[PDB]
């Protein structure tokens, strides 16, 4: 086996809406007080449930919230989805949708999380990323004791995520969190172990991808 | 919301003890883990009931309202935040704060460090970044550092607070820029960590 | 040869089960003198008659740890403090402050922050609302405004802010529980009283000879004296620190009470509500000044070394005074019906005890007669039940009262048990296992009054 | 303890419309077997009513009794359907009417069935000794 996703745009607008939808292994079983829910958190801060659908098209609602949301789905089509009003940029967050299996009625599973969407919001639309080599001019290691990456720049807004020749050359790896780059863009680093003197012999690719935009793009470290 | 601490730190050999609080008939709170910056971590269910297979350390428990959580032997890589879920009114599901863990007397690490040099894209218009990487280090602790010769940081101060690996060890980022000809007339190019007040320096050269 | 199915009803069997029971209880402690009261309502009055029938060759499984009943009894009793919970006095839901220096009354008192004040800032901040005033002891000249300060009214900070006023009643009264019809309740027995595992003298009953509520931190009391010795239990005794109980043949007193008087100055408050502003210096010079017979003591420690030697050989043994924290952790327990208090453990309880060929060492003292002292705290702001955001400023009550205690056991945790000297401190557990005293003896049943079986007999065609 | 089924004995619900379900299956339809002083009186007059109940049901079981079936469930004895009841037919009852049908048919002849019942339980007990009266 069970896994979910969910997925939907990868930028809002200030004052647009927002909309997203939810898929899954699992498929419609009607088991133990089971269903699917909608949840966010705040920047950095705690967690947040907003709704939630159960084994026929039973479904419940924030009291504080509610005119703000809506909640329905086509079930042969097979996602969950969710609709809102127009937004505040606040409402920026990580949303996740997740799998609930509460007993007969009562006690809660909510059993299984999806990867979650970078649901963000702002007044400018997307940028598109750019990618910089970073092997240096002047050189001392030996062995494998080394590890090289790529720069990634002028982007708005996330996710980019990097891969070591199509996964196959991954090992002993770093990846830093994005910063702003104080234009109002974003910036990143990931970085792959390397033997130090045996470059060339073997070649090491960043294989960048940026959502948004939908770029990927490959490049030599070396 | 659900009522808990904000925070919580002890010793790395300790069972810790952690709470929160059901406003409305609680007898059926579950627990979740957040690990930073990814998707949350089921923990125990109905009351008590361990998840089936995830790891053993966890510890299955109970309070009538005091909904109550534990660790039997705590490890480092338990330092995460911490939260109850529980059903309410008309599936009103309701959520806590979070609370911390920090897991005191492990050792610490002292920074892995690299800085990498500007490049030739960059070059080809009048712009510049060294780019400082900061990792392996604990407590989560950072502060950085720069000596582009005499000069202050320079078009984008644009640094990382401390953020935990995938190990419970700690990294950081920073990204101090110039114009191509302030980086071909300046000559030292280096970047220093002062992680806890420890001098930890790394520096490019053509 | 062959067999074929049988089926037999009256069977002797029965299975363990979870459910309710009913209670019986005393037929006078509670009478037309006490209406609407919650001690009187519900359960039903005394059983003299409870039989037994003698379980011959026949022995059965025991768990306290497992067994429901705690739970079953954790749940109706605490129901009195939901019917206690009345409403805040019209001066009081908002944090008001209080001003004083000296106390309000003619002196402050003989011992410690009794320096008793009157509200404030006191919503209309009108003379009506300023001139009603407090007894003072301690929590209550908490800071609020700066250097000077006007006091706080703590108790507006947490969920529920109210008072159990003394009308209501705490009496620990003796109920005497009664399984279901159909369900039955048996009670193990052996001079091997351990509470878990396999028992011999296993024995039945229609209901339970009654046991009774108890409040207590540390300290065990008031209640069901030991068969003839003394004994300890746990869950998993080989645990490096989970919670120990100690049990005891002959009970030693506590000799104390805090008899310092103020009068009972009760007022119809704002808008006819009422309060209990009690005040005046009558018999003002008074403490709890608290004492316990030495020796009465002392053999209890004295022979449990040796017991300790039968779970944790050779060892040099030791106990320490209780943990810190809060006071309530930092003490021993109780209030009379009159005032809260909370004794200094974790002053006490300081001994080790050697466990060689030994003939020395394992006391505060020997051969002396004597006696002993002990001093003690008071917190008349109470977070008045744990695990809850209930709290109280307690009603206070005049002159001495008849009150006094003697000890049936000790709540205990092993502390430090990594070490030679080996340690332990008393207090601990849930508040729950104040309850498991005595309840060791029992377990419930549920009868199934069929089964089934091979035979030869092959039946009609 | 457990639910109600119309009554807290007999359990009409699964009605099954047509007979012959019902019948079928008719053995899972129960196989799956002052502060509070005024409680007193929300105890005394269902008490009485689930008492006399239970008393019913025990005039019933005196019926199944003297129709020497105790304690079964489907039931039969000597008398036939001898031609003149309503002609309905097997083939053609169960698979085109309900109980409550049947009854509002069969209402006439309670008491005159239940007598044929009764004559030939109390003869088949004596005809036995057509072969026992050796003595
Ligand atoms: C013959 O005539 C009968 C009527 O006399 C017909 O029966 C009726 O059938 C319908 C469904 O077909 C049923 O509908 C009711 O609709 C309500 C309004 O939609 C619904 O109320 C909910 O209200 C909240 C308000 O905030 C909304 O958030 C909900 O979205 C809203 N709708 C729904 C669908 O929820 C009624 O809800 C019923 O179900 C809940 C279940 O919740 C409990 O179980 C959960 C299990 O996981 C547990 O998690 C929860 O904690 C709860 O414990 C109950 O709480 C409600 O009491 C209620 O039972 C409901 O859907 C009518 O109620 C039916 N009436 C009767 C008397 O049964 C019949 O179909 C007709 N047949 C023919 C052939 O004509
Ligand atoms: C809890 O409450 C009980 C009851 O109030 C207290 O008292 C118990 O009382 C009995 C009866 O007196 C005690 O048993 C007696 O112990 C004496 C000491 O035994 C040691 O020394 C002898 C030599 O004197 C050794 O042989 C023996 O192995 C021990 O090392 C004995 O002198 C007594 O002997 C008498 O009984 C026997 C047996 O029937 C007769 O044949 C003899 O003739 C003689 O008359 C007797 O055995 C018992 O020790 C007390 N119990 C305990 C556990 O202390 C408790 O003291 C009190 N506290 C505790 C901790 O239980
Ligand atoms: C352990 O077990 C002991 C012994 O039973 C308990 O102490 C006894 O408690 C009862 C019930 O209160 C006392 O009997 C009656 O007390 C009334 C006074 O009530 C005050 O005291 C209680 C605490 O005991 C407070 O909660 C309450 O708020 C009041 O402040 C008296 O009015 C009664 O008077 C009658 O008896 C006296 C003689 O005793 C006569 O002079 C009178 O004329 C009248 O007939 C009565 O006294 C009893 O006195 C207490 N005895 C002792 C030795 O203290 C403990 O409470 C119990 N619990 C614990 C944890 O130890
Ligand atoms: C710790 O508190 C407990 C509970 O209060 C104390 O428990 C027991 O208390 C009694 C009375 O103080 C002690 O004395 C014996 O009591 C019995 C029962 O009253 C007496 O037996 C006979 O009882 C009837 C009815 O009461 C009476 O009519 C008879 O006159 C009376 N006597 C006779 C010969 O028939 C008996 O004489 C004693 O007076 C108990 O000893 C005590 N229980 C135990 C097991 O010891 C306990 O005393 C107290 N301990 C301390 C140190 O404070
Ligand atoms: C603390 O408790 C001890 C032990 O109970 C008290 O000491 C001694 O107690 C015993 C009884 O346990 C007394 O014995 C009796 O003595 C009289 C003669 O006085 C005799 O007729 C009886 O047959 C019986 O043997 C003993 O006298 C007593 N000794 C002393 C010196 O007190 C002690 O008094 C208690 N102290 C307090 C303040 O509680
Ligand atoms: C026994 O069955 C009958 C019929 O189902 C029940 O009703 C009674 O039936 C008779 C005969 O039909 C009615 O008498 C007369 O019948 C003619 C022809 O139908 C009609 O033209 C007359 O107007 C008259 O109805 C009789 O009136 C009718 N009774 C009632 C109250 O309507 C009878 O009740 C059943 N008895 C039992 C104990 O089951
Ligand atoms: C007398 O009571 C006080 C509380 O009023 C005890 O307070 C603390 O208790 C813990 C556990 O014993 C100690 O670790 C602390 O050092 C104590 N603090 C203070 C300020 O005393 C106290 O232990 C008791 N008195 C003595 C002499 O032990
Ligand atoms: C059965 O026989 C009796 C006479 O013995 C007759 O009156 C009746 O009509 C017959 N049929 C039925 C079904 O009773």
């Known amino acids: 086996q069970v896994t979910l996703m969910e997925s939907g745009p990868a930028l809002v607008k200030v004052t647009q809406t927002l909309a997203v939808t939810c898929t899954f292994s699992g498929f419609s079983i009607r088991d133990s007080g089971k269903g699917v829910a909608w949840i966010r958190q705040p920047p950095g801060g705690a967690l947040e449930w907003l709704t939630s659908?159960?084994?026929?098209?039973?479904?419940y609602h924030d009291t504080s919230l509610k005119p703000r949301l809506t909640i329905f789905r086509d079930t042969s089509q097979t996602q969950v989805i969710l609709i809102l009003t127009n937004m505040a940029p606040l409402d920026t967050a990580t949303y996740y949708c997740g799998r609930i299996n509460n007993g007969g009625g009562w006690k809660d599973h909510i059993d299984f999380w999806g990867p979650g969407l970078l649901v963000t919001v702002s007044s400018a639309s997307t940028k598109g990323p750019s990618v910089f080599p970073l092997a240096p001019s002047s050189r001392s290691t030996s062995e494998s004791t080394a590890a090289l990456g790529c720069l990634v720049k002028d982007y708005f807004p996330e996710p980019v995520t990097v891969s070591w020749n199509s996964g196959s050359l991954t090992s002993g790896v770093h990846t830093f969190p994005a910063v702003l780059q104080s234009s109002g863009l974003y910036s990143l680093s990931s970085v792959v172990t390397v033997p130090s003197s045996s470059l060339g012999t073997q070649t090491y690719v960043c294989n960048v991808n940026h959502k948004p935009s939908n770029t990927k793009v490959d490049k030599r470290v070396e | 919301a659900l009522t808990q601490p904000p925070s919580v730190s002890k010793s790395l050999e300790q069972s810790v003890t952690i709470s929160c609080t059901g406003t409305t008939t609680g007898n059926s709170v579950s627990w979740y883990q957040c690990h930073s910056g990814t998707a949350p971590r089921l923990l125990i269910y109905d009351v008590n009931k361990r998840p089936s297979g995830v790891s053993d350390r966890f510890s299955g428990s109970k309070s009538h309202n005091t909904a109550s959580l534990t660790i039997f032997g705590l490890q480092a890589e338990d330092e995460a935040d911490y939260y109850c879920g529980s059903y309410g009114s008309g599936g009103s599901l309701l959520f806590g704060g979070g609370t911390r863990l920090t897991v005191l007397g492990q050792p610490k690490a002292s920074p892995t460090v690299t800085l990498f040099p500007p490049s030739s894209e960059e070059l080809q218009a009048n712009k510049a970044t060294l780019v400082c990487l900061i990792s392996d280090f604990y407590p989560g602790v950072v502060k950085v550092a720069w000596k582009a010769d005499g000069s202050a940081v320079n078009a984008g101060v644009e640094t990382t607070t401390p953020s935990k690996q995938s190990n419970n060890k700690y990294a950081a980022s920073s990204y101090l820029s110039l114009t191509s000809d302030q980086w071909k007339s300046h000559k030292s190019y280096s970047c220093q960590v002062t992680h806890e007040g420890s001098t930890v320096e790394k520096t490019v050269a053509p | 040869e062959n067999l074929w199915v049988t089926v037999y009803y009256g069977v002797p069997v029965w299975k363990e089960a979870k459910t309710t029971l009913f209670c019986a209880s005393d037929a006078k402690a509670y009478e037309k003198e006490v209406h609407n009261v919650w001690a009187t309502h519900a359960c039903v009055p005394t059983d003299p008659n409870p039989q037994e029938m003698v379980l011959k060759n026949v022995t059965e499984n025991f768990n306290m740890w497992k067994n429901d009943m705690v739970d079953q009894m954790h749940e109706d009793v605490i129901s009195l403090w939901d019917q206690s919970l009345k409403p805040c006095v019209k001066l009081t839901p908002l944090c008001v402050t209080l001003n004083c220096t000296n106390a309000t009354a003619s002196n402050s008192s003989i011992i410690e922050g009794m320096k008793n004040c009157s509200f404030n800032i006191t919503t209309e901040l009108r003379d009506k609302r300023e001139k009603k005033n407090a007894l003072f002891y301690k929590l209550d000249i908490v800071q609020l405004d700066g250097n000077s300060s006007q006091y706080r009214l703590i108790n507006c900070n947490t969920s529920v802010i109210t008072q159990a006023c003394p009308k209501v009643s705490f009496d620990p009264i003796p109920i005497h529980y009664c399984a279901p019809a159909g369900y039955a309740i048996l009670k193990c027995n052996n001079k091997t009283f351990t509470g878990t595992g396999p028992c011999n003298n296993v024995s039945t009953v229609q209901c339970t000879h009654g046991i009774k509520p108890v409040v207590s931190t540390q300290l065990l009391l008031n209640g069901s004296l030991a068969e003839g010795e003394i004994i300890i239990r746990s869950e998993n005794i080989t645990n490096n620190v989970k919670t120990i109980i100690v049990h005891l043949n002959e009970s030693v007193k506590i000799e104390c009470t805090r008899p310092n008087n103020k009068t009972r100055t009760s007022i119809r408050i704002g808008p006819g509500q009422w309060f209990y502003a009690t005040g005046q210096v009558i018999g003002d010079i008074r403490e709890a000044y608290c004492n316990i017979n030495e020796s009465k003591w002392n053999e209890t420690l004295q022979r449990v070394s040796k017991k300790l030697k039968e779970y944790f050989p050779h060892k040099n043994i030791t106990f320490q005074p209780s943990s810190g924290g809060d006071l309530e952790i930092t003490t021993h327990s109780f209030n009379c019906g009159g005032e809260f208090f909370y004794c200094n453990t974790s002053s006490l309880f300081n001994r080790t005890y050697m466990a060689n060929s030994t003939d020395m060492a394992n006391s505060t003292e020997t051969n002396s007669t004597r006696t002993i002292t002990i001093h003690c705290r008071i917190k008349q702001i109470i977070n008045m039940w744990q695990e809850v955001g209930r709290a109280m400023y307690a009603p206070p009550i005049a002159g001495n009262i008849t009150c006094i205690s003697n000890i049936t056991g000790l709540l205990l945790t092993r502390d430090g048990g990594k070490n030679n000297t080996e340690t332990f401190r008393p207090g601990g557990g849930n508040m729950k296992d104040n309850w498991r005293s005595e309840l060791y003896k029992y377990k419930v049943v549920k009868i199934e009054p069929l089964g089934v079986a091979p035979t030869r007999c092959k039946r009609r065609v | 303890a457990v639910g109600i089924g119309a009554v807290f004995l007999g359990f009409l619900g699964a009605a099954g419309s047509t007979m012959g379900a019902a019948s079928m299956t008719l053995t899972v339809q129960a196989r799956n077997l002052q502060h509070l002083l005024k409680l007193t009186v929300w105890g005394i007059k269902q008490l009485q009513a689930r008492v006399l109940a239970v008393e019913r049901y025990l005039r019933d079981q005196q019926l199944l009794g003297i129709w020497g079936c105790s304690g079964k469930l489907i039931c039969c004895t000597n008398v036939p359907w001898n031609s003149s009841w309503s002609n309905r037919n097997l083939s053609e009852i169960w698979d085109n009417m309900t109980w409550l049908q049947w009854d509002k048919e069969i209402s006439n002849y309670t008491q005159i069935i239940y007598g044929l019942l009764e004559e030939s339980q109390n003869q088949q007990e004596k005809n036995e000794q057509d072969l026992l009266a050796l003595d």
């Open positions: 659908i159960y084994w026929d098209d039973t479904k």
